Amino acid sequence: SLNKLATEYLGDSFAWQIIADANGIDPTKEIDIGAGLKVPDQKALENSIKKF
Amino acid sequence: EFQLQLELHTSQSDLENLTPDTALYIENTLPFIVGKSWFIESVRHSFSEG
Amino acid sequence: MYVYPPRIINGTLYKSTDLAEYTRGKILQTLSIVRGELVADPFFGVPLRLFSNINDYQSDVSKIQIILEEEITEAQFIVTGDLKNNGIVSLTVYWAYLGTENIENFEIDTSNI
Amino acid sequence: MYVYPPRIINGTLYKSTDLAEYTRGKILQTLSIVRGELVADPFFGVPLRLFSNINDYQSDVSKIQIILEEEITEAQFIVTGDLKNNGIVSLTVYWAYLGTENIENFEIDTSNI
Amino acid sequence: SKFLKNRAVVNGLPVIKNPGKYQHCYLIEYEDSTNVKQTPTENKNKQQQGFPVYLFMMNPENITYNLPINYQEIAIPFTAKNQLNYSNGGNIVMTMSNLILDTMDEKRSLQPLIDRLIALREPTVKKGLKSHPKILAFKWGSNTFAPCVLTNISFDVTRWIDGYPTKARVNMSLKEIQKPSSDSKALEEAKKKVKVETVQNGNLKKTLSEKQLIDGVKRVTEYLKKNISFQPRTIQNILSDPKSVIKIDKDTGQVSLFNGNGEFAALVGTYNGDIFSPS
Numbered sequence A: 001s002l003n004k005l006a007t008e009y010l011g012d013s014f015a016w017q018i019i020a021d022a023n024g025i026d027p028t029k030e031i032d033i034g035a036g037l038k039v040p041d042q043k044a045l046e047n048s049i050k051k052f
Numbered sequence B: 001e002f003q004l005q006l007e008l009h010t011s012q013s014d015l016e017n018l019t020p021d022t023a024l025y026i027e028n029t030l031p032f033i034v035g036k037s038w039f040i041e042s043v044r045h046s047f048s049e050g
Numbered sequence C, D: 001m002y003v004y005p006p007r008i009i010n011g012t013l014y015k016s017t018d019l020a021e022y023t024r025g026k027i028l029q030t031l032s033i034v035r036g037e038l039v040a041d042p043f044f045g046v047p048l049r050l051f052s053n054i055n056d057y058q059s060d061v062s063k064i065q066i067i068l069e070e071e072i073t074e075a076q077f078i079v080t081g082d083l084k085n086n087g088i089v090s091l092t093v094y095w096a097y098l099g100t101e102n103i104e105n106f107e108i109d110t111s112n113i
Numbered sequence E: 001s002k003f004l005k006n007r008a009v010v011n012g013l014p015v016i017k018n019p020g021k022y023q024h025c026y027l028i029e030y031e032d033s034t035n036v037k038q039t040p041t042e043n044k045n046k047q048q049q050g051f052p053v054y055l056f057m058m059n060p061e062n063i064t065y066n067l068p069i070n071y072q073e074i075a076i077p078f079t080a081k082n083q084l085n086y087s088n089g090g091n092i093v094m095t096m097s098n099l100i101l102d103t104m105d106e107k108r109s110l111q112p113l114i115d116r117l118i119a120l121r122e123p124t125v126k127k128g129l130k131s132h133p134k135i136l137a138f139k140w141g142s143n144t145f146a147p148c149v150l151t152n153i154s155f156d157v158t159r160w161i162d163g164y165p166t167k168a169r170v171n172m173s174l175k176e177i178q179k180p181s182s183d184s185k186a187l188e189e190a191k192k193k194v195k196v197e198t199v200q201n202g203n204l205k206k207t208l209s210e211k212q213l214i215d216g217v218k219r220v221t222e223y224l225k226k227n228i229s230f231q232p233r234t235i236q237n238i239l240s241d242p243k244s245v246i247k248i249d250k251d252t253g254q255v256s257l258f259n260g261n262g263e264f265a266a267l268v269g270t271y272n273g274d275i276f277s278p279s
Helices: A002-010 A013-023 C019-032 C059-071 D019-032 D058-071 E111-118 E186-194 E210-226 E233-239
Strands: C075-083 C089-097 D075-083 D089-097 E026-029 E064-066 E070-074 E083-088 E093-102 E124-126 E129-131 E136-140 E148-161 E164-176 E245-248 E254-258 E264-271 E276-278
Touching: A002 A013, C019 C059, C019 C089, C059 C075, C059 C089, D019 D058, D019 D089, D058 D075, D058 D089, E111 E148, E111 E164, E136 E148, E210 E245, E210 E264, E210 E276, E233 E254, E233 E264
Parallel strands: none
Antiparallel strands: C075 C089, D075 D089, E026 E136, E064 E093, E070 E083, E093 E164, E124 E129, E148 E164, E245 E254, E254 E264, E264 E276
16 A cells, blocks of 8 residues: 555655655555556655755 | 952852852951951852753 | 543443553553554554464564553553463563552453443 | 667667666666777776686676676676686676666567567 | 574675685775786886785785774763764774785895885875875775775884895784765766756756857847747837847846847847747
8 A cells, every 4th residue: 555655665654645646646546456656765855855 | 359259069058148139258268358248249150060 | 531442331432530441441452453553653553473483482572562661651561471282372461550559450341241 | 868779769769768778778888898998988897808817707707896886876786707618707797776676677678670 | 603603694695706816915006996907017107007006925814994983972961871963984994913024035125015015105196286195995806995095004024134124024004085986076066967956046057158159149040030020019129220139148048139229128038058948
């Protein structure tokens, strides 16, 4: 589930919103078995912050 | 007419009764210091450890 | 306050004013939840290892004891493990409520449900 | 991006949007360039020692491994060397792309020109 | 002790094949630690030839590695513990003592080796400038230590021939240093800018060159003369003046029209390195 992915990889259960936002997927909808997903890193989430 | 620097270990009575409104009397010291009222210009209480 | 096990008694949630039975309910809640069962806090809960050979069966006892001490600070916990015959590992958690000095009997247990 | 081996496919260079095959092309480019072949940077490349003794054939393996980790930071490299019969020294480079969690096949490999 | 060893951690370690030759360790210049003996014989006048700085005549009997990790204590009064705050990691110190140099039977002087090891204190001459000594790498078989520098060396000589040492014990200490960057500074900044992981105000990552400025003026003039019919009045009437020029900013690429008086009139668009984007 997205909760497990947010917990294992991001260390926070409410971080799942990022993962879905990183994949354009509606969480209420079904994810087929064998479908690929993209999970953000913890240490590599800070370089998505653009400073200007 | 005289200046006195007193650095000493703080006690409770040395905390409540040592204010610039009191008159200091130092005993067991030099004769010209004993028996005279010393006006406290200032008091400082430092705490670096226990 | 409401104690852990949700029971509708006399049309309402069981409401208790004695903190010893509330602590007992908290112990039951902690032991009845495993890490990864709660969503808000996926880390709270006892660690469960069920299908494994019985060699390091004291480590989980120690982990459960430590978790009980950290989560519940109003009670003292001592956890012991015994090996039964077929596949059963019998855990015994001795707990005492620091608020009381004597063993406190609860009347809800005597009631027949 | 343009993978290392310049192949005109469908009238244009092979432009791939998957970083796994781009990383594989990077490994192939690093292994295919000998020190000095490149002008701008004469230090980039794999050291080549061919007509010599095999008494110290593992030092070259270690140097190739270090070069692979230094040049390509998005993959993990393990280089192993074994001795064949006539003159062949077989090098095996085990690489994994850290971005992905599972081994990824490439559909261009099955394509036969 | 092979009955008490933890097989779980042992079996997770790589298996190393025995060399067919007795190996001797050596010190090499860093970045020359990957070069392979470019010539049969070492040439002093050329660099990066893959030859060791110092070849050990006998291997060390043991090597000591020391690593201190620096935390800082803050003693808050009436607390059970000090407050430990991580400061820094520290450098590995490698030490090999009681190294054997022995040429007494060969009647060969050790003085060249001692001179070679001593010369590691002198400054080098990168270009025409005094620089730091050579950054070293201790290599033994397939193993290396680090980019390191020789810190302390000592010799105890017990035998001589004609005043020349022939038997000595050598104690030396190397220290691991921070790995030098092979990305210079133009490249390190450029690749920082490429991933836009740098702080960006509003300028282009590539400041326009004079030829790029000329070509951008060309593109702007072409587009303006093509689209003069659809320009609003306030711009076509200033372009009707032959004394109007087009100026492109060097850092932001903004294109501007300047009238006969030489003042700014209107913004036309933006020009990066390749494409002109009208406003």
